[PDB]
Design an enzyme around this catalytic site. Structure first.
Site, short mmCIF file in Angstrom:
data_model
loop_
_atom_site.label_atom_id
_atom_site.label_comp_id
_atom_site.label_asym_id
_atom_site.label_seq_id
_atom_site.Cartn_x
_atom_site.Cartn_y
_atom_site.Cartn_z
N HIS A 41 0.98 -1.23 -0.15
CA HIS A 41 -0.07 0.22 -0.14
C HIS A 41 0.85 1.21 -0.06
CE1 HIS A 41 -0.17 -0.38 4.63
NE2 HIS A 41 0.24 1.06 4.29
N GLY A 143 2.45 6.01 9.66
CA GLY A 143 3.82 5.74 9.27
C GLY A 143 4.38 4.50 9.85
N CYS A 145 3.64 1.72 9.19
CA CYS A 145 3.42 0.50 8.46
C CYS A 145 4.95 -0.02 7.86
CB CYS A 145 2.54 0.94 7.10
SG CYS A 145 0.94 1.27 7.65
O1 LIG Z 1 -3.96 1.31 8.77
C1 LIG Z 1 -3.22 2.02 8.29
N1 LIG Z 1 -2.09 2.46 8.59
C2 LIG Z 1 -1.85 2.66 10.28
C3 LIG Z 1 -1.35 1.61 10.84
N2 LIG Z 1 -1.15 1.40 12.19
C4 LIG Z 1 -1.67 2.41 13.17
C5 LIG Z 1 -2.33 3.54 12.30
C6 LIG Z 1 -2.69 4.62 13.25
C7 LIG Z 1 -3.15 5.75 12.61
C8 LIG Z 1 -3.40 6.06 11.09
C9 LIG Z 1 -2.85 4.78 10.41
C10 LIG Z 1 -2.36 3.71 10.85
C11 LIG Z 1 -3.30 2.49 6.76
C12 LIG Z 1 -4.09 3.85 6.55
C13 LIG Z 1 -5.50 3.60 6.82
O2 LIG Z 1 -6.13 2.98 5.70
C14 LIG Z 1 -5.46 1.88 5.52
C15 LIG Z 1 -6.07 0.58 4.89
C16 LIG Z 1 -5.70 -0.61 4.63
C17 LIG Z 1 -4.06 -0.63 4.69
CL1 LIG Z 1 -3.39 -2.40 4.48
C18 LIG Z 1 -3.56 0.36 5.66
C19 LIG Z 1 -3.98 1.53 5.95
#
Ligand SMILES: O=C(Nc1cncc2ccccc12)[C@@H]1CCOc2ccc(Cl)cc21
Ligand SMILES: O=C(Nc1cncc2ccccc12)[C@@H]1CCOc2ccc(Cl)cc21
Lengths: 304, 304
Positions: A41, A143, A145
């Site tokens: 992603h 961030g 990820c």
């Molecule tokens: O979840 C995600 N990231 C994050 C991961 N862990 C904590 C977070 C805390 C706050 C914001 C984002 C966070 C991204 C952004 C949101 O939409 C998606 C949808 C699918 C996937 Cl695979 C990833 C994501």
């Protein structure tokens, strides 16, 4: 003595962390040998995260669009490919700090250490478990990820998790290092059922053995139980059913303390039925299920 | 979101860990620049640990008696000196992996990460606090002596603790990197009073702010209190008295949540008086005091 939620030392993993940028999105990557592994992603904008067609999105991307920075130095991308939900970016330089490693898919109820990272930089390390419903209760911000979970056997790092998503329920979802999600999760910003989680029975029992080893014995009783009787109680309290395989892995702890596994089960049964009555066990006022029998053995023996 | 007992990444500290052997005793050392710092009881046998005369014992030791091994390579000892309860062994080679560092004496109630080591090899990392009575509730076995506690500010490692002793009560005691013990502890195998510990009030409040930030708000009430009224309750429950300095350091969290510090105090007051009533906060069934306001800010903001 003393018992802590200990993580593996994170050094071997810090040496693999890089920053991956594509378009406007920046996340963490894992540089092992001449390959950088990151969540796919990284190629998405917020707009197309509602229902991305990853194959189509990746087609608009060339090797020069993936900006990989190891600390302050730029890595030259010579190849890119998608494997399930991860991208593998082949670089022209092998990571001089690549430790001995394996890619392993962990079983639910197993534990691992997470090195939380932001912009390719490590911020902290903590121990956690793959819940029976395949989520992890982590500590992750936007961030994070690309941050990875791992176990270490002497010099070998077994990478088991890569963080991808936070569910609206605050719990976390991710993949193995081949990009396959643990659980039914998909990389789309949509509501996703995590499913009924359960308490990892074998781990609570292992932690009860760690409590006995480290001094806390108030919960030991004059009773015993059978696997059948225990499992009726475990059913009522949303605990995973205990099998002979679990009893077998608790053998070392049973031998260390001289408390038969079924006798420890009767202590857990009384604790489930009566509660802690305001008392604590290893500084906790609840039954802890994030330590496997192997973790208890490792921590109480001193394995490096 | 999510809140964990996170430790700093341990890599910078793993690179400093060495094994120090003297006679029959082996423990861990900290190699920074051309100096190896270790607990001075490395020179003792079990016999003289009942009442060692360290100055006399050290006189029987020459530079060649301190065997310092960094992984698999031997370091050449060119100097030795005792500073309070630590030995400084000057080696002929500066540690190529010496990070930017400081030696700091932490205040009671402050937190730090411990890299538990055996035979100069790291086994795990965990976060802990210097208790108000100057002990730490760690996880240490025989051979763990010389393991260090630390904090990290971007690239600088602030070494604050060196492990020396386990008290008969299962709690741990140690020194700063100048060899001065935290608390009244002495390096002798004798009964030593740790003293009445208290709950770190400012930390429980900071963790209550972290709970609100991460979703858990059941404990918030319609009440407020005064520093005087709160301190009467804190007295009864063996909590450290709250001062205006504590309220001031909780300012950032108060501003983040919009909950006035005295309003959060009234929530803590109700929790102390009524208990959790079988509920949990951030996965805990008790009031957590091992997260400072700075830790809560760092974890909830993502500082690397
Ligand atoms: O979840 C995600 N990231 C994050 C991961 N862990 C904590 C977070 C805390 C706050 C914001 C984002 C966070 C991204 C952004 C949101 O939409 C998606 C949808 C699918 C996937 Cl695979 C990833 C994501
Ligand atoms: O406590 C000590 N070491 C250890 C430290 N942490 C956990 C231990 C667990 C099991 C056995 C030893 C442990 C040593 C040995 C005992 O006598 C003394 C007396 C004084 C001093 Cl400074 C050190 C020591």
């Amino acid at each position: 003595s003393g018992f802590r939620k200990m993580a593996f030392p994170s050094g071997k993993v810090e040496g693999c962390m890089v920053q991956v940028t594509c378009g406007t999105t920046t996340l963490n990557g894992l540089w092992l040998d001449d390959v950088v592994y990151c969540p796919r992603h990284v190629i998405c904008t917020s707009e197309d995260m509602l229902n991305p067609n990853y194959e189509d999105l990746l087609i608009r991307k060339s090797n020069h669009n993936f900006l990989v920075q190891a600390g302050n130095v730029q890595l030259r991308v010579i190849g890119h490919s998608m494997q399930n939900c991860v991208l593998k970016l082949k670089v022209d330089t092998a990571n001089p700090k690549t430790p001995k490693y394996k890619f392993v898919r962990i079983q639910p109820g197993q534990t691992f250490s997470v090195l939380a990272c932001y912009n390719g930089s490590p911020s902290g390390v903590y121990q956690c478990a793959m819940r029976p419903n395949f989520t992890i209760k982590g500590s992750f911000l936007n961030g994070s990820c690309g941050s990875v979970g791992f176990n270490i056997d002497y010099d070998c790092v077994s990478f088991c998790y890569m963080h991808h998503m936070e569910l609206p329920t605050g719990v976390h979802a991710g993949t193995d290092l081949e990009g396959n999600f643990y659980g039914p999760f998909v990389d789309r910003q949509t509501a996703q059922a995590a499913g009924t989680d359960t308490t990892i029975t074998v781990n609570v029992l292992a932690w009860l053995y760690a409590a006995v080893i480290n001094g806390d014995r108030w919960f030991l009783n004059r009773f015993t139980t059978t696997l059948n009787d225990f499992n009726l109680v475990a059913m009522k309290y949303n605990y995973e059913p205990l099998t002979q395989d679990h009893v077998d892995i608790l053998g070392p702890l049973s031998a260390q303390t001289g408390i038969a596994v079924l006798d420890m089960c009767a202590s857990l049964k009384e604790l489930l039925q009566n509660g802690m009555n305001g008392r604590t066990i290893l500084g906790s006022a609840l039954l802890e299920d994030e330590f496997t029998p192997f973790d208890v053995v490792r921590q109480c023996s001193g394995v490096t």
